[PDB]
Amino acid sequence: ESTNYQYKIQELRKLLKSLLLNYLELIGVLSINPDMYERKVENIRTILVNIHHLLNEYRPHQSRESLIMLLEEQLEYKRGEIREIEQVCKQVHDKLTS
Amino acid sequence: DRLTQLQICLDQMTEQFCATLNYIDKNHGFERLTVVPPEEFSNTIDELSTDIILKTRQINKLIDSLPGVDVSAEEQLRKIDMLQKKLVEVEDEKIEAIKKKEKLLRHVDSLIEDFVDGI
């Protein structure tokens, strides 16, 4: 079973709008009857929570992108180390032929 | 250092989403449907509301930049595997090179040693 993250990001993007609207109402930008006011506050707390659990569940997939980022990085370093050794051998050829 | 800079960036919002509800609570903001004039309040509420909209934007642009979104756990698990391998290969290449260079060096040194005057 793949813990589909393309999905987790969907939600995350949703909760975010949902969180923004709900805040837009609490403030008064959007209209809402006062017997809801506190439910808005309810929703914001709950929203911000779920979001946390998401980003929370996203670290594994995050970790991998980091490894794949390190390996990439060091692999590029070593490659460079060789191409640097190579140069020297070429400069020794130049320096030898003058 | 991204999923956490996101997470990090998302605390601020939680902080400003309380740094607001505080005002609204501690200034009878509920009664808006020593006291702060109906102007100051609004200037304040807008000063925060607006600030929070900008955070919402930022948090997305970041979620978009967030790495790994599109990719699978498998598409990654191999990509790592590969890099692991292509990495060994490159070190053996590095080793070899190093050796060959040191041999070259030994050659040069030998030469230089035989040009010396004094026993």
Side-chain angles (χ1 to χ4, degrees):
Chain A
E1 286 190 301
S2 56
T3 310
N4 190 319
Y5 296 78
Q6 343 299 307
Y7 184 64
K8 297 322 172 194
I9 301 300
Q10 285 183 48
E11 294 287 298
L12 188 62
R13 292 178 196 287
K14 271 175 204 170
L15 311 178
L16 257 170
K17 102 170 174 181
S18 195
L19 169 75
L20 183 64
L21 300 175
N22 258 292
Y23 175 76
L24 264 315
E25 307 188 292
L26 164 59
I27 292 182
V29 160
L30 295 183
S31 198
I32 288 187
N33 31 306
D35 49 315
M36 288 264 101
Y37 176 105
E38 214 76 36
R39 276 337 178 195
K40 288 315 152 174
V41 190
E42 176 173 330
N43 286 337
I44 291 183
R45 262 239 159 62
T46 298
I47 300 293
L48 288 176
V49 135
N50 301 307
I51 289 182
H52 147 285
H53 270 125
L54 252 41
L55 269 52
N56 223 46
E57 308 181 325
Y58 191 68
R59 222 160 298 143
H61 209 244
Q62 170 48 294
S63 288
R64 301 171 209 134
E65 291 294 306
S66 291
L67 184 38
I68 292 174
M69 274 186 70
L70 190 53
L71 303 179
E72 287 209 347
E73 186 178 298
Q74 26 194 61
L75 176 49
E76 173 63 8
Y77 187 75
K78 291 179 180 177
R79 285 221 166 81
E81 281 197 298
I82 307 179
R83 294 175 184 181
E84 200 166 297
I85 295 180
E86 271 179 27
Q87 278 306 308
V88 184
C89 275
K90 280 193 180 185
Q91 294 176 52
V92 175
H93 169 73
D94 286 7
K95 187 56 200 171
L96 225 44
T97 52
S98 289
Chain B
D1 202 56
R2 289 183 181 188
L3 163 59
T4 76
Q5 89 174 52
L6 185 74
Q7 280 186 148
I8 275 184
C9 217
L10 176 140
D11 255 309
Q12 299 187 64
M13 270 207 295
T14 343
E15 297 186 324
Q16 202 88 324
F17 265 44
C18 273
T20 279
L21 189 66
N22 211 49
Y23 206 72
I24 302 179
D25 267 343
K26 291 183 176 184
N27 290 293
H28 329 303
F30 190 41
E31 186 82 317
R32 300 292 175 170
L33 311 177
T34 307
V35 185
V36 296
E39 188 187 70
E40 183 179 62
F41 185 73
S42 205
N43 286 320
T44 304
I45 289 299
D46 295 316
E47 175 176 65
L48 307 188
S49 137
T50 182
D51 200 295
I52 276 171
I53 306 189
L54 160 54
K55 286 285 169 192
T56 305
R57 154 169 273 148
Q58 307 188 181
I59 191 181
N60 288 293
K61 280 187 185 173
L62 295 202
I63 292 185
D64 293 338
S65 302
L66 200 206
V69 293
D70 309 299
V71 178
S72 167
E74 196 182 57
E75 176 175 346
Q76 302 181 310
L77 279 187
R78 64 167 151 272
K79 176 74 152 293
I80 68 168
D81 184 48
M82 169 190 106
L83 293 178
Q84 286 182 56
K85 294 176 182 174
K86 231 165 70 178
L87 210 46
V88 176
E89 277 171 25
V90 178
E91 184 79 56
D92 293 7
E93 285 184 37
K94 188 192 173 196
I95 282 175
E96 208 51 61
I98 286 170
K99 289 170 175 176
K100 286 179 176 174
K101 161 181 165 173
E102 278 284 333
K103 194 178 191 73
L104 181 61
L105 176 55
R106 263 176 278 136
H107 195 325
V108 201
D109 281 329
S110 153
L111 295 186
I112 301 167
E113 185 182 64
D114 289 303
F115 290 97
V116 182
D117 285 342
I119 302 179

